Amino acid sequence: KLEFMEMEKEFEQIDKSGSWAAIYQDIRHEASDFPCRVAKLPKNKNRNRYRDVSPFDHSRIKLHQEDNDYINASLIKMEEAQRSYILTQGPLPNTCGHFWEMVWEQKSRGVVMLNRVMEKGSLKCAQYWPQKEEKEMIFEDTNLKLTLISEDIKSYYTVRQLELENLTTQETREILHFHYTTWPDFGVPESPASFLNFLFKVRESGSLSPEHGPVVVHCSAGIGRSGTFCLADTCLLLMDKRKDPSSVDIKKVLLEMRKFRMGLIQTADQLRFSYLAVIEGAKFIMGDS
Numbered sequence: 001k002l003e004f005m006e007m008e009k010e011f012e013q014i015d016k017s018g019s020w021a022a023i024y025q026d027i028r029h030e031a032s033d034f035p036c037r038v039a040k041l042p043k044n045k046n047r048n049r050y051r052d053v054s055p056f057d058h059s060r061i062k063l064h065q066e067d068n069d070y071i072n073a074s075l076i077k078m079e080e081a082q083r084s085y086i087l088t089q090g091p092l093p094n095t096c097g098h099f100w101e102m103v104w105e106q107k108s109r110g111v112v113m114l115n116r117v118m119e120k121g122s123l124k125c126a127q128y129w130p131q132k133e134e135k136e137m138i139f140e141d142t143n144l145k146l147t148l149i150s151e152d153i154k155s156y157y158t159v160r161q162l163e164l165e166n167l168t169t170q171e172t173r174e175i176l177h178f179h180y181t182t183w184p185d186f187g188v189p190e191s192p193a194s195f196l197n198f199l200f201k202v203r204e205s206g207s208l209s210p211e212h213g214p215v216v217v218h219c220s221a222g223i224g225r226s227g228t229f230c231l232a233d234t235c236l237l238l239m240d241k242r243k244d245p246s247s248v249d250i251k252k253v254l255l256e257m258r259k260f261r262m263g264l265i266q267t268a269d270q271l272r273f274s275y276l277a278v279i280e281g282a283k284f285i286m287g288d289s
């Protein structure tokens with residue numbers, strides 16, 4: 001029982017010794033590496049938002065296009081946690097069709113967005129979804145139609161319901177879009193509570209359920225914020241299923257996740273935040289709630 005005051009004690013111990021950056025750099029250097037040949041092909045240069053962030057060849061999501069099957073997106077599968085996620089970059093002006101094509105083919109039912117489309121001091125992301133219910137979007141290259149159906153705006157996040165339609169089979173699917181709007185580039189969420197609240201919300205939607213395809217998670221590069229979000233989620237799952245919560249080594253989990261996509265969690269503070277959100281979140285889930 002009193003095993004929760006343990007992990008939070010070593011957390012404060014790490015905080016006391018200011019060892020976060022050390023642990024984080026240790027993780028960057030223990031991180032596995034795999035080839036990204038497809039990602040680096042000249043024809044896929046314009047499909048990559050950033051020169052140095054690429055999906056590994058083994059876990060990259062392949063588009064069912066006959067021509068070019070590339071999309072900077074990676075499938076992260078966590079066995080013990082029993083959860084899969086697709087991490088991708090913020091869609092580019094020329095890859096919005098690819099993005100939705102992937103959402104369709106992969107049968108995902110939810111999209112989690114952790115970055116903002118624009119501002120001034122923030123990385124730009126393409127407006128890959130319709131902002132107005134009356135202005136649906138058609139992606140000619142992927143023969144898909146997208147319509148905004150609902151848009152519940154809250155303080156730290158907006159929940160939108162979209163309708164994605166395969167113009168060929170004429171099938172339509174409800175896609176839930178969870179947009180956390182207060183997580184700056186290379187920063188942390190507004191607070192652990194808002195982050196968790198957002199996470200629990202995405203959870204309760206069933207968007208992460210094994211019933212549907214893997215949820216799609218992205219920020220700008222698809223590694224810092226996306227990695228933090230997924231790491232927190234997986235670790236919470238693990239602390240809930242395991243008899244011994246403190247047996248969950250967030251560091252091992254992150255390294256495990258990095259085998260599927262490079263650079264997950266981009267700052268020492270994000271790592272700290274993941275520990276903090278997981279400990280607090282674990283307390284909540286096991287504390288009556």
Ligand SMILES: COC(=O)c1ccc([C@@](C/C=C/c2ccccc2)(Cc2ccc(C(F)(F)P(=O)(O)O)cc2)n2nnc3ccccc32)cc1
Nearest residue numbers: 050051052053185186219220221222223224225226263266
């Ligand atoms: C001035 O613009 C920026 O703020 C900026 C910061 C970092 C970067 C990264 C920096 C590259 C980092 C990297 C490279 C190799 C392995 C792992 C990480 C890409 C990147 C952007 C944002 C994030 C994030 F953390 F905000 P996310 O939450 O959206 O994921 C991550 C990465 N990047 N990718 N290729 C580069 C080539 C030269 C210099 C920097 C480069 C790009 C732009």
Ligand SMILES: [Cl-]
Nearest residue numbers: 028263264266
């Ligand atoms: Cl890194």
